[PDB]
Amino acid sequence: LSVQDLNDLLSDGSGCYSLPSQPCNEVTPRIYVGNASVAQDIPKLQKLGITHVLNAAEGRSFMHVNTNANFYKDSGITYLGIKANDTQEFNLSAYFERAADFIDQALAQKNGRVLVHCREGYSRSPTLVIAYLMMRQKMDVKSALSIVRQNREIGPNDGFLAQLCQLNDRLAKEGKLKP
């Protein structure tokens, strides 16, 4: 398993990634991935039945989404923010466990649905969902990435892909990828 193998799963014949055609998509049952605009549109969130929002790009830069728990208080939506940067050197894997635990809490509610979003819904938030699928649903990285990519055009940066590969190797050795 290499980063290049994941690049290939994200790429077409000519070697190009694609770009999200919709502001958000349900990538696995009751888990949505989306962009900044959907995060900040509470009426649309309610029509989608979203009860829980994980902002994987929390902050005040043009690469972040400047929301917080208070933004969602009136709506009754439950919030967690992760201040991640979309760069190859950023250590997103430090947040995989707390992200996975938040997703699990959302899904434990009978009618719970979680939006995991960042600025573009392209790199940061899909990486967290792929890690959740590996850690909590026992899917190997290729099948987790492939199911998300089947449902939304994503492109985690190569640092995030490397982090997913390191996770996969560890979980495989521990015998934790046997669904």
Residue with the two structure tokens 């290729």:
142
- Residues 66 and 64: their CA atoms lie apart, in Å, by 6
112: domain CATH number is 3.90.190.10
Contact 101, 52 (CB under 8 A): no
Radius of gyration of the chain (CA): 15
The closest alpha carbon to 75, from 43, 30, 116, belongs to 43
The count of structural domains within the chain is 1
Report how this structure was experimentally obtained. X-ray
Please tell me the chain's helix, strand, coil percentages from 3-state DSSP, rounded to the nearest 5.
Answer: 45, 15, 40
- Residues 35 and 69: their CA atoms lie apart, in Å, by 18
Contact 92, 54 (CB under 8 A): no
Q: DSSP letter string over 114-129?
A: EEEE-SSSSSHHHHHH
The experimental resolution of this structure, in angstroms, equals 1.8
**What is the distance between the terminal CA atoms of the chain, rounded to a whole angstrom?**
19
Half-sphere exposure of 125 (CA within 13 A, CB side): 36
Domain around 99: 1-179
* Active site members: 118
